[model samples]
Target: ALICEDKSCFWKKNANNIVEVPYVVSGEFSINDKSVIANAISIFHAQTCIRFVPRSIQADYLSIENKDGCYSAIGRTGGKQVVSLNRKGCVYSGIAQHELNHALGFYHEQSRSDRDQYVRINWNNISPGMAYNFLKQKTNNQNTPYDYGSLMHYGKTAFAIQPGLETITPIPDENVQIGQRQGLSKIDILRINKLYGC
Candidate 1:
């Protein structure tokens, strides 16, 4: 699966074939927020070979912090990288998982190169400054079907200027769900396995 353009962004698999990713939660988060972040990271243990461990002296690691909003870089940066989960609006488990996935190199599902066939972007209702969000990426699908329920996919109302306007829609079946606030969809899990050769 193509997440990043190069292998340099990927966390290396150790001799045991486990992709151990080191990370640290910022002290700014409250005890509850800390617990939530921990729970979100724990999800990877049972489902994938990617292990999130407390940072030691690792040169490249994730710094989970309460920033302005819920966001993360698309993949690993050489040194310490920020995976922001804003304390007020982004402290939920689902949001943490989403940002963590981004830190793990997954992109927004709308950016999948084959997205137009599965979803229609309504440019008319889109926020004027946000059209770039709809641009496609050179995503490698890993032979997985388009997941309408992917956590990475934005909802139909995402980036809409008008309230309730649909900015993204499943074409053939307009009623299909396209966003998630729960956790990784099954296809997401498969993508991780394929990307990491788990």
Candidate 2:
């Protein structure tokens, strides 16, 4: 459901080279929660053409909510679409960036169809009922190579069977760290610019 094969998934840019995607934050968020969300939205303004602006008569937009977990729809869904942040576990800046990228039409780096070229999945080490998180998607990848530093990528022990057990390992160089939420990496910015023709 997250391949982003639909052309309509992309938000349109204006003639002036700015794409203003309207969004509405849930009323449940605290002032501090809003601050974290604001910080998340501000990152794109500095590095990409995507602008997350407040809603004002827009037909298609984002509905940011406090749901069960940190999740978001793959991309634009014609009408009001959700980008959830569970106030407790999902109110971090890194998580916000990760989920927003999903809303911006990107999938996890490890879930790409070409992931086998960069990382190995330890099937037996995967947590029960969570192996689907490792399934590869048919991705366009925007012609970008594997980005181990991408905020969209998972860590070594994600969905692991137990503590210190690895579920994803970077091929050949297993020592490389593959998971972190430290904002967008260079390749992440590149993909966004290339995808939107910025």
Candidate 3:
């Protein structure tokens, strides 16, 4: 068994070798906000075989909305999955991409099974309840290097109870930056391709 946890949480690819995910954005977004979402989706179109299209009658589709927070379920959860991007703070390109990646069956980069080899998590620094966010997952890393530059990686101070304190630190190279909110890294794109057999 290849272990179907991460590998199993994916949208089915069509016979044409493409995965088409239908989505509908909430009207709470302004035209500019909608444009940002479109551009973020375009990155997947350009870099991988995942194509996000407007919903027609697809039973299982993404319901992009301005909810209370920026978050998403990790991959296809069947009908009407909500990918929330709150208007005040979650409307940026990188943030949208981050949530979108989660909906695409990817977890935070640092949450991979091999993460201890790349980064150190300071449990004391994270709030007690929030510490679960730092737990490593059984991620199928797709044979790629640990990417410190992944958009899915958390910031150094993520979940820190005290401001300006480090929580997640890179091993052996503490200076290496993590938690980049920029667009997807090359490795991010590569994993999507590998996972989708693109």
Candidate 4:
């Protein structure tokens, strides 16, 4: 597996137009389905600065379609909800949460403000494309997240972590039995709470 890590688009930014209340769900396709998307939407609403004001207001805001897997998520300028594509198969609800977090102005988990302490990423091993994806500068200056525990962070997948691309020793609080996404961890909630404050 090839790992990309070049920090080229270091200036990439997010356009955070705050929607006090977001409306997610309505119709959907396979891959990233409605349920998975809703899980993420709920997470951001409960965890981030944005709140879910009312379903009635949200009912007309979301739009889903078959992107055929091109992009992961999409949000409009004034829309309340950001829609994600249904191309990632059955989908990991957590991924939806991660993407939803993106919609709420969060960056990748590894990009957090304090990521240097976690792991020593061998820059030579990273892919230029992946690195550029994170560097795109947004208008609101919503900076990257520093928490590895953030729901938005990517985990060692079966192809990567399981195949030796990476290794992990999850903390006791993340899971009681080891390896699962039952819900976001305490740190995850805390970070969001710190930002959202509601």
The residue-level lDDT of candidate 4 at 32 comes to: 41
Query: Each prediction's Cα lDDT score?
Result: 0.86, 0.88, 0.88, 0.43
lDDT of 4 by residue, 1-198 (tens): 011134121112225634454444435454346556566567656645555443564332434344443222322234444444555542456655554444444455544444444533433334444445333233222343344445544553322322445323234233323223555666666644544433
- Tally clashes: model 3: 0
Least well predicted 10-residue stretch by lDDT in candidate 2: 1-10
Model 1, TM vs. native: 0.95
lDDT of 1 at 183: 86
lDDT of 3 by residue, 98-136 (tens): 998898888998888999999999988897799889988
Estimate, for each residue in 104-166, the C-alpha lDDT of model 2 and write its tens digit.
888899988888989999999998999988999868877678889999999999988888899
Per-prediction TM-score: 0.95, 0.94, 0.95, 0.54
For model 3, what is the alpha-carbon lDDT of residue 77?
84
Question: Which pairs of residues collide in candidate 3?
Answer: none
> Cα RMSD (Å) between model 1 and the true structure?
1.4
Candidate 4 local distance difference test against the native: 0.43
Worst 10 residues of 4 by lDDT: 1-10
The digit string of per-residue lDDT tens for model 1 on 34-119 reads: 88887887777779999999899999999988788899887777899998898889998888888888887888888888898899
Q: Which parts of model 1 are misplaced by more than 4 Å?
A: 1-6
- How does model 2 score by TM-score? 0.94
